[PDB]
Amino acid sequence: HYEEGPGKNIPFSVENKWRLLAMMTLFFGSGFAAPFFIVRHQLLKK
Amino acid sequence: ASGGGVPTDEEQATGLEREVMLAARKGQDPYNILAPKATSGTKEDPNLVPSITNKRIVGCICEEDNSTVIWFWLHKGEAQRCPSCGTHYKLVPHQLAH
Amino acid sequence: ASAAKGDHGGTGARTWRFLTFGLALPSVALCTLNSWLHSGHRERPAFIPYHHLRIRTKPFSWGDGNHTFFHNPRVNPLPTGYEK
Amino acid sequence: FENRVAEKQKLFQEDNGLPVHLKGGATDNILYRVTMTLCLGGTLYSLYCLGWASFPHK
Amino acid sequence: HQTHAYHMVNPSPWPLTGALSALLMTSGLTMWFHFNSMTLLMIGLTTNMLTMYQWWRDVIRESTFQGHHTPAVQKGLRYGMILFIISEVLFFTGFFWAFYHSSLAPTPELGGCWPPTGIHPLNPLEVPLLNTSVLLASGVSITWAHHSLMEGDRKHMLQALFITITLGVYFTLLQASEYYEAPFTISDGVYGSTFFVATGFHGLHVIIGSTFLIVCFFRQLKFHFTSNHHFGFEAAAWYWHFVDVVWLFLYVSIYWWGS
Amino acid sequence: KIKNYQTAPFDSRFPNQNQTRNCWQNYLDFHRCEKAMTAKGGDVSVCEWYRRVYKSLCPISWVSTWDDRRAEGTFPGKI
Amino acid sequence: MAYPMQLGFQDATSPIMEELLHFHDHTLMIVFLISSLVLYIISLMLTTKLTHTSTMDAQEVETIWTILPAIILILIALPSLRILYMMDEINNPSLTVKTMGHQWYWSYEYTDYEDLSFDSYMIPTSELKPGELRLLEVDNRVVLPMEMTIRMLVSSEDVLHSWAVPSLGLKTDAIPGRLNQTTLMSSRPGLYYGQCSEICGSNHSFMPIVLELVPLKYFEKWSASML
Amino acid sequence: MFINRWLFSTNHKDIGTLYLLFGAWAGMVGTALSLLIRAELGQPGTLLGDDQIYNVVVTAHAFVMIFFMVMPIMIGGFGNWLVPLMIGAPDMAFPRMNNMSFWLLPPSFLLLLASSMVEAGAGTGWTVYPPLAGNLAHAGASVDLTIFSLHLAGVSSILGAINFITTIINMKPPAMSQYQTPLFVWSVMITAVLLLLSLPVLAAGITMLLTDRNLNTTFFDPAGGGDPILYQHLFWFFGHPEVYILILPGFGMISHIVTYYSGKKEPFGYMGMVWAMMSIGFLGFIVWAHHMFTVGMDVDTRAYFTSATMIIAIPTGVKVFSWLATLHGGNIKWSPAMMWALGFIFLFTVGGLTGIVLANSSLDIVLHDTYYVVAHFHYVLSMGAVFAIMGGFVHWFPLFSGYTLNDTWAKIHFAIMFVGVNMTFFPQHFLGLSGMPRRYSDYPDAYTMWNTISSMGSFISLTAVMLMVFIIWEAFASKREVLTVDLTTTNLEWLNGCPPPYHTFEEPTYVNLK
Amino acid sequence: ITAKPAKTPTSPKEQAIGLSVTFLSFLLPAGWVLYHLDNYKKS
Ligand SMILES: CCCCCCCCCCCCCCCCCC(=O)OC[C@H](COP(=O)([O-])OCC(O)COP(=O)([O-])OC[C@@H](COC(=O)CCCCCCCCCCCCCCCCC)OC(=O)CCCCCCCCCCCCCCCCC)OC(=O)CCCCCCCCCCCCCCCCC
Ligand SMILES: CCCCCCCCCCCCCCCCCC(=O)OCC(COC(=O)CCCCCCCCCCCCCCCCC)OC(=O)CCCCCCCCCCCCCCCCC
Ligand code: HEA
Ligand code: HEA
Ligand SMILES: CCCCC/C=C\C/C=C\C/C=C\C/C=C\CCCC(=O)O[C@H](COC(=O)CCCCCCCCCCCCCCCCC)COP(=O)(O)OCCN
Ligand SMILES: CCCCCC/C=C\CCCCCCCCCC(=O)O[C@H](COC(=O)CCCCCCCCCCCCCCC)COP(=O)(O)OC[C@@H](O)CO
Ligand SMILES: CCCCCC/C=C\CCCCCCCCCC(=O)O[C@H](COC(=O)CCCCCCCCCCCCCCC)COP(=O)(O)OC[C@@H](O)CO
Ligand SMILES: CCCCCC/C=C\CCCCCCCCCC(=O)O[C@H](COC(=O)CCCCCCCCCCCCCCC)COP(=O)(O)OC[C@@H](O)CO
Ligand SMILES: CCCCCCCCCCO[C@H]1O[C@H](CO)[C@@H](O[C@H]2O[C@H](CO)[C@@H](O)[C@H](O)[C@@H]2O)[C@H](O)[C@H]1O
Ligand SMILES: CCCCCCCCCCO[C@H]1O[C@H](CO)[C@@H](O[C@H]2O[C@H](CO)[C@@H](O)[C@H](O)[C@@H]2O)[C@H](O)[C@H]1O
C-alpha cells in the first residue's frame, strides 16, 4: 500500500533539507531561466 | 414480435451493484445511498448512526434550510451531541457487511 | 401537429418496429427513387478565373499541393482552369 | 451465441491483486507494453524533431 | 472496506498514454502541414486508438464483469455524457455562426451576394433530401432497438440496431459521393470553407456514432446489456440523436436557405 | 445639372461606421449606368455623380483591382 | 502629444474629446467616491475588539446595496451613451480622406477631386532635426483644413492596424476589405500626433501619425503641390 | 510505487498536488517573461534589438500566466484537493479521466514553449488575430504550435469541467441540498459550467484559423469573402467568460478565508453570494464585444454592449459588501492568509472600477490598446487572482502538507509583494490616459518616468517570488507538524487531520433528513 | 492552528544559506544571459 502522513503524500523526499534545497533550486531555477535562454536562442539564430 | 434472450439484473448483476440490489429488496442501505430519517434526538431517543469502526463524521443541519452543516466525529460510546443545537447521536457499530 | 395516425395503446417496441417498416424505410426508398433518377452529371460549369475561388495561400500537404482532397477533374478546375 | 458473462465475471473478480487493465491474462501485459513503448518512442522522437525545427537550415 | 456505492478506480496508465498520444497527433499535424511528414501523425493515431480501446475495455471490465456500476455511479455517467454532448453543441455553434456571419452579409469579393458569384450549389431535393430521410429513419429504428432491449427481445434489439448502423453507413457513402461529385471545394472561398468544414465535422461525428453503435452491437451479441442496465447503449442512442439533429440544422441552414 | 461636388454627402442607406458597401454600390451604379448609355445611344454625362462618390470613398487599390478584373472578365459583380 | 510626467488625457483638440474629458471627470469622481468608501469600511471593520460572531439576517441591507449601485450606474450610462450617439450623427462633411495601414507605414488618399496619394513614414532617430520628437515625427504629414468636418475612411492593405489621434479622440481600427468611417473636426491649427493602436508585427511601435491642421487656403495649395 | 502513485493516480489529492507543482513551475516561466517585458521598457531604446522577440515574450507571458499558472492552481490544484473534502466525497466522479485533465497540460505547455523556439515565434499577442496570425505575416509552425497548445489545454479543461459538475451534482450526502454546499464548491461548479460552454467556441475559432493557415479556407481572409471580425467575435465569445473563469474560484477562496479568519461559522449572505456568482456566470456570456469597441460595429450594438457590461457591477458588488459584512464583528486573526484576502478585496475593487470606466464605448475609443487596459487587468489578475491564490496557499498549505509555514516570513512576503505590484501597475494608469499604446517595445520620450518606475516595481515583486520559494523550503526543512485546527465544525476539509489520508470518507458522512 | 516544535530545526545560519542559494539560483543564470546581450545582438 501507499504511505501516509507528513512528508509522504508528495512525489519528492523532504528527508534531507539540503538535498531538498538542491531539488527545489533546479525546479523553480530551470523554470525562471527558460525564457532568458529562449530569448538568447532567438537572438543567436538571427 | 415476442421472444426473450436479454438477461435481467436479477440473473446477471454482480459485485457491489448486486449487493445494493439485494439490500434494497430487504429495505436496507448498507452503502448509504439514501438520506437516513432522523429520530427526535433526545438523550433516550438518540439518532442511531451506523459505523463500521469506532467513529464516523456526523453532519448536522440543526434547522432546515440553514446553508451551513455542523460536522463533528461521533465515537463509540455514550451518545454525543451536536455542538450547535445539541440533538443526540449514538454509534450503533458493525456488521452492515458480514 | 399530431401527424395523422394513432397508437399509444399497448406501447410495444412493436409500434416503433411498425413505424420503422411502415413509414421510416418506405420514405428512405421514395427519396432514393426520386434521387437516383434526378441524378445525371450536371453538364459541368464553365471556367471563369475569379480570384475569390481556387484559393492557394499555402500548398496542400499532399500531391503537388494544388489539388483538393476529393478533387474531381470533371467538375473541379485548378486555379488555371480544367485538366485533361 | 452463448452468454458467457458470468465466466468473465469470475475471472475479473478473482482476488489475485492485478490492476483491472492486466486482470485478463498475458495479452493485456503485451498490449500495455506495446502502447507505452510506442508512446515513449514517439515522445522521444517528437522532442528530437522539435530540436531539428528550433535551428534553421539553408 | 468502503460503505459508499462510488467506484474507486485502479491506478490506470491510459490517462498518460492518452496525453502523450495527444502530443504525438498535434506534433504530427505540425510535422505534416509544415515539414511534409506523417511518421509522427501515424504513430500518434495508433497510441490514441490503443489508449481508447484499453480505456473503454477497463470500463466494461469494471461494469459488466466486476459490477462497480451501482445506481449512483450510473447517474454520474448520464450527467457526464449529457455535459459532453452540450460541449459539442457549443462546438458546432462556432461553425453555424461563421456560416450565418458570411451568408447574411456577403462581401464585394463574392459579388455582394449569396451564394457567391461563381458557386454552382447542390440541389437540396436531390441527395441531401435522401441523407435527411436516411438519418431521420435511423432515429425511428434505434428507438425500436431501445424498446426491444427493455422488453427483453434479443433478436429484435439486434435486427433494429443493425438497420440503424446500415442507415448510418448508407449516409456516410452518400456524403462521400456528394463530396467527390460537388463542383465546389474547401478552397472555393468562404462558401467552400463554411460548407466542407461544417458537414465534414458532422460527417466525422456520424462515423464516431456508427462506431459507437457497432461497439454496442457486439457487446449485445455477447449479452453484456441487461433488460434494465445498458448505459453504453443509452449514451450511443443519445449521441445518435445529436448527430441526426445537427444534420437537420446543416440541411435547413447551408443546403436549403443558403442556396 | 445638380453639381458643385466637395465630397460624398451622408447617405441614409449606409448610416453606420462600415462604408465598405457605400464604395461598392456607387461603383456598380456607375459601371451599370456607363454601360446602359454607350450601348443604347445616349451620353455617360448622367453617370458622373456615381463616379465622383465611388472615387471619393473607394480606396485606389480597390478601384484599381476592380477595374483590372472588369477588363479580365473575373469581376464578381452583376454589371 | 504627451509631455513628461503627464497624469491625465492629452489637451483636447476637438469638441468630442472635450466631452470625453468632462465625462471621464464625472466617472472618475464616482470611482473615487466608491474606492474611498470601501477603504474606509475595511478599516472600520478591522479596528474594534467588539465582536458579534452569531448569525446576521441577510435579506434587508442587501436592498440598500443593490439599488444604490444601479442608480449610480444610470448616472454613468446616460452621459456615456449621449457622447457615443454624438460620435456618429448626420455630420455632412466638406472633405473625405482615406488612410491605409501597411507594415509599417500609413498611406493617405485625397481623391475628392484629383488622385492625391502619399506614404507617411516615421523619421528614423539618427535622421532627426534638433527639436523633432523621437518615434513621433513622419516624413510626410497629413495636411487637413482646420475648423472643417472631414470624413476619415480607415482600411488596411495587409493586417490589422488602428488609426488613433488621442488629442482629437480618434481610434478607428484599420481592417482589410473593410472601410471604417470616423469624422474629424480640429477646433485649432497645429501638429497633433498619434501611433498605430493594433499589433501589426515587428514595427507596431514605429508607424506614427501626424496631423498638420492649417487653414483651407494653405491646404488647397499643398494638395496641388503633392500631385 | 512512484509510477502507480504519481503517473497512474486515480486520487483527487495526489492529482491536486501534481497541478500545484505544474502552476508553481509555469509561474516561474510566466514571471521571467514579465521581467523581460519590463527590462525592455525600463529605459528608452530597444534592449532585445528585435521587436518580433518582444512580441513573442509578451504573447507567451499571457498564455503561461492564464492557462498554465492561474487555471491549473485554482481549478486543477485547490479544486481537486478541496471539492471532494468539502462535500464528504471519497473522490471525483471520474477519478481516471481526471488524471488525463492533468497530463494533457505538460504537452500543452511543451507545444507553446516549442512555438517560441521554432522560426521567429508567435509574436501575435495572446488574442492571435488574423491576418497577423495568418500564414503570410506569420509563415511557419509557431502559430500552428500555439493553436495546438491551446487545443490540448482546451480539452483538458473541458474534461475537468465535466468531472467537477458531475462530482458536485451527484456525490454529496443524500441529505445534502446544493444550498448546503460551501461557497468554494459553488464557485468551481459555476466556473466548470463557464469552461463547458466557452472553450468549445474557442476550439471552433482557432480550428477555422488552423484551416485558413493550412487548408486554404478563407473564414477570416477577405480575398475569399472572409472577415477578420468573425474571429474576434468567436475569440471574445470565449474570451470574456475566460476572465470570469479566472476570478470565480478566487471569490470562493476569499469567501472561505475572510469567514475563517473572522471566526464566523458562515459567510454573510450565503444565498446572495450564490445568486451573485450565478449572475456573473450568466451576464459574462452576453458582454463580449466591449473588446471590439473600435472595429466599427453599429452605434446601437455599441450602446447595448456598454449598457449590458455595466450590470455585472451589481452582482459583483453584492460580493464585495458581503465580505466586508463577514468581517463585521469578527474576532479577526491577522494571519498571512487574511492579509492576502483583505489585499484582494481592495485591489480587486480598484481593478473592477477601471473596468467600469472601459465599459463606455465612448471612452474606450481613447483607452483601447493603451496601458489603462493593461492597468485594469493586472489589478484584477496580479492583485486579484494572485492574492486569492497566495491566501488559499498559506491558509491550506498545512492541510495539504501536514507542516506549517513561518507566519512572520509569510507576512514579510505579503508586504514586499504588496509594494511591488502597486509600484509596477499603478503608474500604467497615467501611461493609458496620456496615450501610450499596448504592445510597444519603445515609447516617445515623454513616457519615460512611469516606465522607469513601473519596471523598478517589477524587480521588487521578483524579490517576493524568490522569498516565497525559500519560505516553502523553510517549512519543509523545519518539519513543524500540525497538532490542532480551529473551526472544524464548519470546515469539513480540516476534519480528517493534516495531511488527510490517501482515502478519506471510505465510510461516507452521516447526515439526517429530519 | 497550533503545531509541535520543528522536528529538524533550521538555525538562523542554515536559513541565511538556504535563502542565499535560493536567491542565487534565480539571479546568476538570468544575469549571465542579460549580461551577455551585446554579444548576441551583434554575433
Ligand atoms: C413519431 C415520429 C415519426 C418520425 C418519422 C421519421 C421518418 C421521416 C420520413 C417522414 C417525414 C414526412 C415529412 C413530410 C413530407 C415532406 C415533403 C418534402 O419536403 O418533400 C418534397 C419533395 C419534392 O420533390 P422534388 O424532387 O423537389 O420535385 C421538384 C423537382 O426537383 C423539380 O426539379 P427541376 O425543375 O430541376 O426538374 C426538371 C425536370 C426535367 O424535365 C423533364 O424533361 C421531365 C422529366 C420527367 C421526370 C419523371 C419523374 C417521375 C417521378 C414521379 C414518381 C411518382 C410515383 C412513384 C411511386 C413509387 C413508390 C416507391 O425534372 C422533373 O421531371 C422533376 C420531377 C419532380 C417530381 C417529384 C418527384 C416525386 C417525389 C414525390 C414523393 C413524395 C412522398 C412524401 C413522403 C411520404 C412517405 C411517407 O418530395 C420528394 O421528392 C420526396 C419526399 C419524400 C419524403 C421525405 C420525408 C423525410 C425527409 C423530409 C423531411 C422534411 C425536411 C426537414 C426539415 C424541415 C424543418 C422545418
Ligand atoms: C507610484 C507613483 C505615484 C504617483 C504620484 C503622483 C504625483 C503628483 C504630481 C502633482 C500633481 C500636479 C497637478 C496636475 C493636475 C492634473 C489634472 C489631471 O488631468 O489629472 C488627471 C488624474 C487625476 O488623478 C489624480 O488626481 C491622481 C490620483 C492619485 C491617487 C493617489 C494614490 C497614491 C499611491 C502611492 C504610490 C503607489 C503605492 C501605493 C498604491 C496604493 C493603491 C491606491 O489622472 C487620473 O485620472 C488618475 C486615474 C486613477 C484611477 C485609479 C483609481 C483608484 C485608486 C485608489 C483610490 C483610493 C482613494 C483613497 C486614498 C488612499 C491613499 C493610498
Ligand atoms: C480576472 C480578470 C478580469 C476581471 C474579473 C475583469 C472584470 C471587468 N472588466 Fe476586464 N479585462 C481583463 C480581465 C478582467 N476583467 C483582461 C485580461 C482584459 C484585456 C483583454 C485583452 O485585451 O487582452 C480586460 C479588458 C476589459 C475591457 C476592454 C478594454 C479594451 O480592450 O479597450 C473592458 C470594457 O468594458 C473591461 C471591463 C470589465 C468590467 C466591467 C468588469 C467587471 O467584472 C468588474 C466588476 C467589479 C467592480 C465594479 C468592483 C466591485 C463592485 C463594486 C464596488 C460595486 C459598486 C461599483 C460601482 C457602482 C461602479 N475589461
Ligand atoms: C494571470 C494573468 C497575468 C499575470 C499573473 C501577469 C503578471 C505580470 N505581468 Fe502581464 N499580462 C497579462 C496577464 C498577466 N500578467 C495579459 C493577459 C497580458 C496581455 C498580453 C498581450 O498583450 O497579448 C499581459 C501583458 C503585460 C504587459 C504589456 C506588454 C505590452 O503590451 O507591451 C506588461 C507590462 O508591464 C505586463 C507585466 C506583468 C508583470 C510585471 C507581472 C508580474 O510581475 C506581477 C507579479 C505576480 C507574480 C510574479 C505572480 C506570483 C505567483 C506565482 C509565481 C505563482 C506561485 C504558485 C504557487 C504558490 C503554487 N503584462
Ligand atoms: C466522407 C465523409 C466524412 C468526412 C471526413 C473524412 C475525411 C477527413 C477526416 C476528418 C475531418 C476532420 C475535421 C475537419 C477538418 C477539415 C475539413 C475536412 C472536410 C472534408 O472532407 O473536406 C474535403 C477537403 O478535406 C481536406 O482537405 C482534407 C484535409 C485532411 C486533414 C484533416 C483535417 C485537419 C484539421 C484538424 C483539426 C482538428 C482540431 C480538433 C480539435 C479537437 C476539438 C477540441 C472536401 O474536398 P474538396 O476536394 O475540397 O471538395 C470536394 C470537391 N469535389
Ligand atoms: C437563445 C437565443 C436568445 C435570443 C437572442 C437573439 C440573438 C441572436 C440570434 C439572431 C441572429 C440573426 C441576426 C439578426 C440581426 C442582424 C442581422 C445580420 O445580418 O447580422 C449578421 C451577423 O449575424 C450573425 O450571423 C450572427 C450569428 C449568431 C451569433 C449570435 C450569438 C449567439 C450564439 C450562442 C447561442 C448558443 C445556444 C445554442 C443554440 C441551440 C451580419 O452583421 P451586419 O451588421 O448585418 O453586417 C452588415 C452591415 O454593414 C449592415 O449594417
Ligand atoms: C476513424 C475513427 C477515428 C476517430 C477517433 C475516435 C474514435 C472512436 C470513438 C468511438 C466511441 C466508442 C465508445 C465506446 C464506449 C464503450 C464503453 C462503455 O460502453 O461503457 C459503459 C458505460 O458508459 C460509459 O462509460 C460512457 C462512455 C462514453 C462514450 C463517449 C464516446 C464519444 C467519442 C467522441 C470522441 C471524439 C469527439 C470529436 C472530436 C473531434 C458500460 O456500462 P453499461 O453499458 O451500462 O454496461 C454494464 C452492463 O453490462 C451491466 O449491467
Ligand atoms: C488535433 C487533435 C486534438 C486532440 C485532442 C484530444 C485529446 C485526447 C484524446 C485521447 C483521449 C481518448 C481516450 C478515451 C477517454 C475516456 C473517457 C471516459 O470514458 O471517461 C468516462 C467518464 O466520462 C464520460 O462518461 C463523459 C465524457 C466522455 C468523453 C470521452 C472522451 C473525450 C475525448 C475528446 C474530447 C474532445 C472535446 C470535444 C469538444 C471540443 C469514464 O471515466 P473514468 O474516470 O475513466 O471511469 C470511472 C469509472 O467509474 C468507470 O467504470
Ligand atoms: C480530431 C480528429 C482528426 C485527427 C486528424 C486527422 C488525420 C488526417 C489524415 C489524412 O491523411 C491523408 O494524407 C495523405 C498525405 O500524404 C494522403 O495521401 C497522399 O500521400 C501520397 C504519398 O506521398 C501522395 O503521393 C498522394 O498525393 C496521396 O494523396 C491520404 O489522402 C491520407 O492518408
Ligand atoms: C531580472 C533578472 C536579472 C537580475 C539581475 C542579476 C543580478 C546579478 C546576477 C549575477 O550574475 C551575473 O554577474 C556577473 C557580472 O557582475 C557576470 O559576470 C560575467 O562577467 C564578469 C566580468 O564583469 C566575469 O568575471 C565573468 O566571467 C562573467 O562572465 C555573470 O556572468 C552573471 O552571472
Ligand SMILES: C[C@H](CCC(=O)O)[C@H]1CC[C@H]2[C@@H]3[C@H](O)C[C@@H]4C[C@H](O)CC[C@]4(C)[C@H]3C[C@H](O)[C@]12C
Ligand atoms: C446471432 C443471432 C442468433 C440468435 C441469438 O444469438 O440468440 C442473430 C439474431 C438476429 C440476427 C441479425 C438480424 O436478423 C439482422 C440481420 C439479418 C441479415 O440476414 C444480416 C445479418 C443480421 C445482422 C443478423 C445477424 C445474426 O444472425 C443475428 C444477430
Ligand SMILES: C[C@H](CCC(=O)O)[C@H]1CC[C@H]2[C@@H]3[C@H](O)C[C@@H]4C[C@H](O)CC[C@]4(C)[C@H]3C[C@H](O)[C@]12C
Ligand atoms: C429568493 C432568493 C433565495 C432565498 C432562498 O430560497 O433561500 C434570494 C437570494 C438572493 C436574493 C437577491 C439578492 O439579495 C439581491 C437583490 C436584493 C434586492 O433587495 C431584492 C432583489 C434581489 C435580486 C434578491 C431577490 C431574492 O431575495 C434572492 C434572489
Ligand code: CUA
Ligand atoms: Cu500598424 Cu500596429
Ligand SMILES: [Cu+2]
Ligand atoms: Cu470582456
Ligand SMILES: [Mg+2]
Ligand atoms: Mg486593439
Ligand code: NA
Ligand atoms: Na524599450
Ligand SMILES: [O-]
Ligand atoms: O433503458
Ligand SMILES: [Zn+2]
Ligand atoms: Zn445540530
